[PDB]
Design an enzyme around this catalytic site. Structure first.
Site, mmCIF file in Angstrom:
data_model
loop_
_atom_site.group_PDB
_atom_site.id
_atom_site.type_symbol
_atom_site.label_atom_id
_atom_site.label_comp_id
_atom_site.label_asym_id
_atom_site.label_seq_id
_atom_site.Cartn_x
_atom_site.Cartn_y
_atom_site.Cartn_z
ATOM 1 N N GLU A 179 0.810 -1.200 0.000
ATOM 2 C CA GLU A 179 0.000 0.000 0.000
ATOM 3 C C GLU A 179 0.851 1.260 0.000
ATOM 4 O OE1 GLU A 179 -1.685 1.457 3.673
ATOM 5 O OE2 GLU A 179 -1.345 -0.490 4.615
ATOM 6 N N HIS A 185 -10.604 4.184 3.757
ATOM 7 C CA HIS A 185 -9.845 3.477 4.775
ATOM 8 C C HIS A 185 -9.980 1.960 4.652
ATOM 9 C CE1 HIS A 185 -8.624 6.913 7.402
ATOM 10 N NE2 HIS A 185 -7.594 6.081 7.497
#
Ligand SMILES: [Zn+2]
Length: 108
Positions: A71, A100
């Site tokens: 990520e 999120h």
């Protein structure tokens, strides 16, 4: 600084690495980043967090033997981290989340 969805996605698929403005969470902590103080831009000017392994525990992203996910933060300039992330696999599939990690959509 390259920190947009399109900029980072295209850099990854081309160079097979994040641009130079990214550091890992461990690297940021060593420099003095304290999450609860929102101080990344003070301690590591021009940097964004990125490059850590993402577990994919929930199995939301497509899985395959030998595929690893990582990520990186997107759209960060200063303050607390936001909710935007790029997710990239060892085989160069690219997903986005703006919530999120609750939901993902493919962008490459
Ligand atoms: Zn390469």
């Amino acid at each position: 600084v390259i920190n947009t969805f399109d900029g980072v996605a295209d850099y990854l698929q081309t160079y097979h690495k994040l641009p130079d403005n990214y550091i890992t969470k461990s690297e940021a902590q060593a420099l003095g980043w304290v999450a609860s103080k929102g101080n990344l831009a003070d301690v590591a000017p021009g940097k964004s967090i990125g490059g850590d392994i993402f577990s994919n525990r929930e199995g939301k992203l497509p899985g395959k033997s030998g595929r690893t996910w990582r990520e990186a933060d997107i759209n960060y300039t200063s303050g607390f981290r936001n909710s935007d992330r790029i997710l990239y696999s060892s085989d160069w599939l690219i997903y986005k989340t703006t919530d999120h990690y609750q939901t993902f959509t493919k962008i490459r």
